[PDB]
Coordinates of C-alpha atoms and ligand atoms in Angstrom, one line a residue:
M1 CA -67.8 -17.3 -44.1
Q2 CA -64.6 -19.3 -45.4
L3 CA -61.8 -16.9 -47.4
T4 CA -62.2 -16.6 -50.8
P5 CA -59.2 -15.0 -53.6
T6 CA -62.2 -13.9 -56.0
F7 CA -64.0 -11.7 -53.6
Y8 CA -63.6 -8.6 -55.0
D9 CA -63.9 -9.6 -58.7
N10 CA -67.4 -7.9 -58.9
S11 CA -67.6 -5.3 -56.2
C12 CA -63.6 -3.7 -56.9
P13 CA -61.3 -5.4 -59.5
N14 CA -58.9 -3.4 -60.2
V15 CA -58.1 -3.9 -55.5
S16 CA -54.8 -5.3 -56.1
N17 CA -53.7 -2.7 -59.1
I18 CA -54.4 0.2 -56.6
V19 CA -52.7 -1.1 -53.8
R20 CA -49.8 -2.4 -56.0
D21 CA -48.9 1.0 -58.4
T22 CA -49.2 2.9 -54.7
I23 CA -46.4 0.2 -53.6
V24 CA -44.3 1.1 -56.7
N25 CA -44.7 5.2 -56.7
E26 CA -43.2 4.8 -52.6
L27 CA -40.8 2.3 -54.0
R28 CA -38.9 4.7 -55.5
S29 CA -38.2 7.3 -52.7
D30 CA -38.3 4.2 -50.1
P31 CA -37.5 0.9 -51.2
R32 CA -38.0 -0.6 -47.8
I33 CA -41.3 -0.2 -47.6
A34 CA -41.3 -3.2 -49.5
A35 CA -40.1 -5.2 -46.9
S36 CA -42.3 -3.3 -44.6
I37 CA -45.2 -3.9 -45.8
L38 CA -44.8 -7.4 -45.2
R39 CA -43.8 -7.1 -42.0
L40 CA -46.8 -5.5 -41.2
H41 CA -48.6 -7.9 -42.1
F42 CA -47.5 -10.4 -39.8
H43 CA -47.0 -8.5 -36.5
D44 CA -51.1 -8.1 -37.8
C45 CA -52.1 -11.6 -37.8
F46 CA -49.7 -12.7 -35.1
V47 CA -52.1 -10.5 -32.6
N48 CA -55.8 -10.9 -33.0
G49 CA -55.7 -12.5 -36.1
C50 CA -56.0 -10.8 -39.3
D51 CA -58.5 -7.8 -38.3
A52 CA -56.3 -4.5 -39.4
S53 CA -56.3 -4.0 -35.2
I54 CA -52.7 -3.0 -35.7
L55 CA -53.9 0.3 -38.0
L56 CA -55.5 1.1 -35.5
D57 CA -54.4 4.5 -32.9
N58 CA -54.8 6.0 -29.2
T59 CA -58.9 6.1 -27.8
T60 CA -59.0 6.2 -24.4
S61 CA -60.5 3.8 -23.6
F62 CA -57.7 1.0 -25.3
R63 CA -54.3 1.4 -26.7
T64 CA -52.9 1.3 -29.6
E65 CA -50.7 -1.6 -31.1
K66 CA -48.1 0.2 -32.6
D67 CA -46.9 0.9 -28.6
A68 CA -45.5 -2.6 -28.1
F69 CA -42.0 -3.8 -28.2
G70 CA -41.6 -5.3 -31.4
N71 CA -43.5 -2.3 -32.8
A72 CA -42.7 0.6 -30.7
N73 CA -40.0 2.8 -32.7
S74 CA -39.6 -0.3 -35.4
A75 CA -42.9 -0.8 -37.7
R76 CA -43.5 1.6 -40.1
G77 CA -45.4 2.5 -43.9
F78 CA -48.7 3.5 -41.5
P79 CA -48.6 6.2 -44.4
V80 CA -48.2 4.1 -46.9
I81 CA -51.0 2.0 -45.8
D82 CA -53.7 5.1 -45.6
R83 CA -53.0 5.4 -49.1
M84 CA -53.8 2.5 -51.9
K85 CA -56.6 3.4 -48.3
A86 CA -57.5 6.1 -50.1
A87 CA -57.4 4.9 -53.6
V88 CA -59.4 2.2 -52.9
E89 CA -61.7 4.2 -51.5
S90 CA -62.5 6.5 -54.2
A91 CA -62.4 3.5 -56.9
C92 CA -64.5 1.3 -54.5
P93 CA -66.4 2.7 -51.8
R94 CA -67.2 1.6 -48.0
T95 CA -65.7 -2.5 -50.4
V96 CA -62.3 -3.3 -49.0
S97 CA -61.2 -3.8 -45.8
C98 CA -58.3 -2.9 -43.9
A99 CA -57.4 -5.8 -43.2
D100 CA -58.1 -7.6 -47.3
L101 CA -55.6 -4.7 -48.0
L102 CA -53.1 -5.3 -46.0
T103 CA -53.2 -8.8 -46.8
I104 CA -52.6 -8.2 -50.5
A105 CA -50.3 -5.5 -50.0
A106 CA -48.0 -7.8 -48.2
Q107 CA -48.6 -9.7 -51.4
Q108 CA -47.4 -7.4 -54.0
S109 CA -44.4 -6.2 -51.6
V110 CA -43.4 -9.7 -52.1
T111 CA -44.4 -10.1 -55.6
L112 CA -42.3 -6.4 -56.5
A113 CA -39.2 -8.0 -54.3
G114 CA -39.1 -10.5 -56.6
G115 CA -40.9 -13.2 -54.9
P116 CA -43.8 -15.4 -56.1
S117 CA -47.0 -14.3 -56.7
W118 CA -50.4 -15.8 -56.1
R119 CA -53.5 -14.2 -55.2
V120 CA -54.8 -14.6 -51.0
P121 CA -58.1 -15.5 -49.6
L122 CA -59.9 -12.6 -49.2
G123 CA -63.0 -11.2 -46.9
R124 CA -61.7 -10.3 -44.3
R125 CA -63.2 -8.1 -41.5
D126 CA -61.9 -5.6 -39.5
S127 CA -61.4 -5.5 -35.9
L128 CA -63.1 -2.4 -33.5
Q129 CA -60.1 -2.9 -31.4
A130 CA -57.2 -2.8 -30.2
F131 CA -55.0 -5.3 -28.2
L132 CA -51.4 -4.0 -27.2
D133 CA -51.1 -7.0 -24.0
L134 CA -51.7 -8.8 -26.6
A135 CA -49.3 -7.5 -29.1
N136 CA -47.0 -7.8 -26.3
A137 CA -47.2 -11.3 -25.1
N138 CA -47.9 -13.2 -28.6
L139 CA -44.7 -11.0 -30.9
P140 CA -41.9 -12.8 -31.6
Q141 CA -38.6 -11.4 -30.2
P142 CA -35.3 -11.8 -31.9
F143 CA -34.1 -13.6 -28.7
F144 CA -35.6 -16.0 -28.9
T145 CA -34.8 -20.0 -28.2
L146 CA -36.3 -22.5 -30.9
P147 CA -38.5 -23.1 -28.9
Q148 CA -39.6 -20.4 -29.2
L149 CA -39.6 -19.4 -31.8
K150 CA -42.4 -22.8 -32.3
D151 CA -44.5 -22.0 -29.2
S152 CA -44.8 -18.3 -29.7
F153 CA -45.9 -19.5 -34.0
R154 CA -48.3 -22.6 -32.1
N155 CA -49.4 -20.1 -30.2
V156 CA -51.9 -18.2 -33.3
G157 CA -52.1 -20.8 -35.1
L158 CA -48.9 -22.2 -36.8
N159 CA -48.0 -25.4 -35.8
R160 CA -45.9 -26.8 -39.1
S161 CA -42.0 -26.5 -38.6
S162 CA -42.8 -25.2 -42.1
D163 CA -44.6 -22.1 -41.4
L164 CA -42.1 -20.8 -39.8
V165 CA -39.3 -21.7 -42.2
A166 CA -40.2 -20.8 -44.9
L167 CA -42.2 -17.2 -42.8
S168 CA -39.0 -17.3 -40.9
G169 CA -38.4 -16.6 -45.6
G170 CA -39.3 -12.8 -44.8
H171 CA -35.7 -11.9 -43.7
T172 CA -34.8 -12.1 -46.9
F173 CA -34.9 -8.0 -47.2
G174 CA -35.2 -5.6 -44.9
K175 CA -33.5 -4.0 -42.1
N176 CA -32.6 -4.4 -38.2
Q177 CA -31.2 -2.4 -35.5
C178 CA -27.7 -2.6 -34.2
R179 CA -29.3 -3.3 -31.0
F180 CA -31.3 -6.0 -31.5
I181 CA -27.7 -8.8 -32.1
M182 CA -25.3 -6.4 -29.7
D183 CA -25.7 -9.3 -27.3
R184 CA -24.8 -11.9 -30.1
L185 CA -21.8 -9.8 -31.2
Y186 CA -19.7 -8.5 -27.3
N187 CA -21.9 -11.0 -24.7
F188 CA -24.9 -13.5 -26.3
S189 CA -26.0 -15.1 -22.6
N190 CA -23.4 -13.8 -20.5
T191 CA -20.9 -15.2 -21.1
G192 CA -18.5 -12.3 -22.2
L193 CA -17.8 -14.3 -25.8
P194 CA -20.2 -13.4 -29.2
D195 CA -22.3 -16.9 -30.0
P196 CA -20.9 -19.3 -31.6
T197 CA -23.3 -19.7 -34.3
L198 CA -22.6 -16.5 -35.8
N199 CA -19.7 -16.8 -38.8
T200 CA -16.0 -15.7 -37.2
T201 CA -15.7 -13.0 -40.5
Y202 CA -19.2 -11.9 -40.4
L203 CA -19.0 -11.3 -37.3
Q204 CA -16.4 -9.4 -37.9
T205 CA -18.3 -7.5 -40.4
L206 CA -21.1 -7.2 -38.2
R207 CA -19.0 -5.1 -35.2
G208 CA -17.7 -3.1 -37.4
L209 CA -21.5 -2.0 -38.0
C210 CA -22.3 -2.1 -35.0
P211 CA -19.1 -1.1 -32.4
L212 CA -20.1 -1.4 -28.7
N213 CA -21.9 1.1 -27.0
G214 CA -22.0 2.6 -30.6
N215 CA -26.1 3.6 -32.4
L216 CA -28.2 1.0 -31.2
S217 CA -30.7 2.4 -33.9
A218 CA -28.4 2.2 -36.9
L219 CA -30.2 0.2 -39.7
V220 CA -28.3 -3.4 -41.0
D221 CA -29.8 -5.5 -43.6
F222 CA -31.3 -8.8 -43.0
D223 CA -29.9 -10.8 -45.9
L224 CA -26.5 -10.0 -46.7
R225 CA -26.3 -11.8 -50.1
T226 CA -29.2 -10.0 -51.8
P227 CA -30.6 -7.1 -49.2
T228 CA -33.2 -5.7 -51.6
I229 CA -34.0 -9.2 -53.3
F230 CA -37.3 -11.1 -52.1
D231 CA -35.4 -14.6 -52.8
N232 CA -33.5 -18.3 -51.4
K233 CA -30.7 -16.4 -50.2
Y234 CA -31.9 -16.1 -46.9
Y235 CA -31.3 -20.0 -46.5
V236 CA -27.6 -20.2 -47.8
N237 CA -26.2 -18.2 -45.3
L238 CA -28.0 -19.9 -42.4
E239 CA -26.7 -22.9 -43.5
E240 CA -22.6 -20.8 -43.3
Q241 CA -24.1 -19.1 -39.9
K242 CA -24.3 -15.9 -41.6
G243 CA -27.7 -15.5 -40.3
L244 CA -28.2 -12.4 -38.6
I245 CA -30.5 -12.0 -35.8
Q246 CA -30.2 -15.1 -33.0
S247 CA -34.0 -16.3 -34.1
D248 CA -33.4 -17.0 -37.6
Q249 CA -29.2 -18.7 -36.7
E250 CA -31.5 -21.8 -34.7
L251 CA -33.5 -22.1 -37.2
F252 CA -31.1 -24.0 -38.4
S253 CA -28.3 -24.6 -35.4
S254 CA -30.3 -24.6 -32.3
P255 CA -30.5 -28.5 -30.9
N256 CA -33.6 -28.9 -31.1
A257 CA -33.1 -27.7 -35.5
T258 CA -34.0 -31.4 -35.9
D259 CA -36.8 -30.9 -37.6
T260 CA -36.1 -27.6 -39.6
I261 CA -32.5 -28.0 -40.5
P262 CA -33.1 -30.1 -43.5
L263 CA -36.2 -27.8 -44.4
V264 CA -34.0 -24.9 -44.4
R265 CA -31.1 -26.9 -46.8
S266 CA -35.1 -27.5 -48.8
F267 CA -35.4 -23.9 -49.2
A268 CA -31.4 -23.0 -49.7
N269 CA -31.5 -25.6 -51.9
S270 CA -33.8 -24.7 -54.2
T271 CA -36.2 -21.5 -55.4
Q272 CA -39.2 -23.0 -56.1
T273 CA -39.5 -24.5 -52.9
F274 CA -38.7 -22.6 -51.0
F275 CA -41.4 -20.2 -53.1
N276 CA -44.2 -23.2 -52.4
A277 CA -43.2 -22.9 -49.4
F278 CA -44.0 -19.7 -48.3
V279 CA -47.2 -19.7 -50.5
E280 CA -48.2 -22.0 -48.2
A281 CA -47.4 -20.7 -44.8
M282 CA -48.9 -17.3 -45.9
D283 CA -52.5 -18.1 -46.5
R284 CA -52.3 -20.4 -43.3
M285 CA -50.6 -16.8 -41.7
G286 CA -53.7 -15.3 -43.6
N287 CA -56.3 -18.0 -43.0
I288 CA -55.3 -16.0 -38.6
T289 CA -58.6 -16.4 -36.8
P290 CA -60.6 -14.2 -39.8
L291 CA -63.2 -11.8 -39.2
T292 CA -66.1 -12.9 -42.4
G293 CA -69.2 -12.4 -42.7
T294 CA -70.7 -9.7 -40.5
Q295 CA -68.6 -9.7 -38.0
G296 CA -66.1 -6.6 -37.7
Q297 CA -67.2 -4.1 -39.7
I298 CA -65.2 -2.1 -43.5
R299 CA -63.8 0.3 -41.9
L300 CA -63.2 4.0 -43.7
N301 CA -60.4 4.6 -42.6
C302 CA -58.0 2.1 -41.6
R303 CA -57.1 4.8 -37.9
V304 CA -59.8 5.0 -36.6
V305 CA -62.8 1.9 -36.2
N306 CA -66.7 2.9 -37.7
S307 CA -68.5 5.6 -35.6
Ligands
LIG1 C1 -39.3 -16.5 -36.4 C2 -39.9 -15.0 -35.5 C3 -39.5 -14.0 -36.0 C4 -38.7 -13.0 -35.2 C5 -37.6 -13.0 -33.3 C6 -38.0 -11.5 -35.6 C7 -38.0 -10.6 -35.4 C8 -37.6 -9.2 -36.4 C9 -36.9 -7.5 -35.9 C10 -36.1 -7.6 -34.7 C11 -37.1 -7.0 -37.3 C12 -35.9 -6.0 -37.2 C13 -37.0 -4.8 -36.8 C14 -36.1 -3.2 -36.5 O1 -35.2 -3.3 -35.9 O2 -36.2 -2.7 -35.1 C15 -37.3 -7.6 -38.2 C16 -37.7 -6.9 -39.4 C17 -38.3 -7.7 -40.0 N1 -39.2 -8.9 -40.0 FE1 -39.1 -10.8 -39.2 N2 -38.7 -11.6 -37.5 C18 -39.2 -13.2 -36.8 C19 -40.2 -13.4 -38.7 C20 -41.2 -12.4 -39.6 C21 -42.3 -13.0 -40.0 C22 -43.0 -14.1 -39.9 C23 -41.7 -12.3 -41.1 C24 -42.8 -12.0 -42.4 C25 -43.0 -12.8 -43.3 C26 -40.7 -10.7 -40.9 C27 -40.7 -10.0 -41.7 C28 -39.6 -9.1 -41.1 C29 -39.5 -8.4 -41.9 C30 -39.9 -7.0 -43.4 C31 -38.9 -6.8 -41.2 C32 -37.9 -5.7 -42.1 C33 -38.6 -5.1 -41.9 C34 -37.9 -3.2 -42.2 O3 -37.5 -3.2 -42.5 O4 -39.2 -2.5 -41.6 N3 -40.7 -11.5 -39.7 N4 -38.2 -9.2 -37.1
LIG2 CA1 -54.3 -8.0 -35.4
LIG3 CA1 -32.0 -11.5 -50.9

C-alpha cells in the first residue's frame, strides 16, 4: 500500500498538532530534544526500515536496538515519544502507529528548529521485533570514509549522493561526544598527528573542549555557527574545513568527493536548495521498506509488541 500524507486526515486530523505541542513543551527544558528526535527517526529507518523497531525494549526472545553501538549511551528522547504516543492514543485510540508517530515527530522537530515544513507520507505500521545485529551492521560510524558512508546508505536503499549530502545536514544542530573526534584531534589514522582536513584554528578550539585523557562523554555542537538552528550553515562549515566529525568533512574533502563537493556548495549557497533537497531525501528515507496495509500492527505502547 502506497504511503500517503493524508492517511490520518479522517481518523486523527490532530495527530501532527499533538506531536508538535509535545515537542514545544519539551524544548523549553531540553533544547536538544528536537535534534534527538530527528536522529531517532533516522536510526529507525536505517534498520529494517521505518517500523519503530528501535522503540522496542528488551525481551527474552530478542535484544533491543537500544544497546547497539550507535544507540547505546547515545540515542535519547524515548520518554518523549511515549508522551506524545499516549496523548495521540487518547485523542485517537489505536489509530496512529509508532512508526508514523516518530516520522511526524521528526518532521515537526525539523520545522520547530527553523527548518522546512511539509507533510510526510503516512501509513507505516509497527514491527513485531527489534533488530540489534542489523543495527550494528547498518548504522554508519563517524570514522567511515566517504566510500563506506556511501555504501551504508546504498545498503538501506539510498543510492543518491544527494541523499547522503542532504541528510547529513541533520548535523546543522545537535550534540556530539568528544569520544568520536579524539582521533581527529590528536592521532588520526595512527599518524600521531591531527586530521589535516580539520581547520587548524578550529582544531585548537576543539582541543580545548576535548583535551587528551579528558571527559570523553563531554558534548560539543555539530554546527559551530548555529548549534540549535536548522539551517544550511552546516555546509558553510564544511567549505572552511570546519566539519565536526570525519564523516562530515569527507563530504567535501575526500578524494572520492567529486560528486559530493558540488552538492555541499549548492546547499551552502542556497537555503531553499538545501531545504528542498532535505525534504526530498527525508521522504525517501521515510519510504524505506515500510510495513503497510495489514502487515505489522498499530502498537499501543511503542516499547512492546501488542499481546
Ligand atoms: C552520514 C552518516 C552519519 C554518521 C556517521 C553520523 C554520526 C553521528 C554521531 C557520532 C553522533 C553523535 C552521537 C553521540 O555523541 O552520542 C550523531 C548525532 C546526531 N546525528 Fe548523525 N550521523 C550520520 C547521519 C545522520 C543523519 C542521516 C541524520 C538525520 C537526518 C543525523 C542526525 C543526527 C542528530 C540530530 C544528532 C544529534 C543528536 C542529539 O544531539 O541528541 N545523523 N551522528
Ligand atoms: Ca527500524
Ligand atoms: Ca545550524
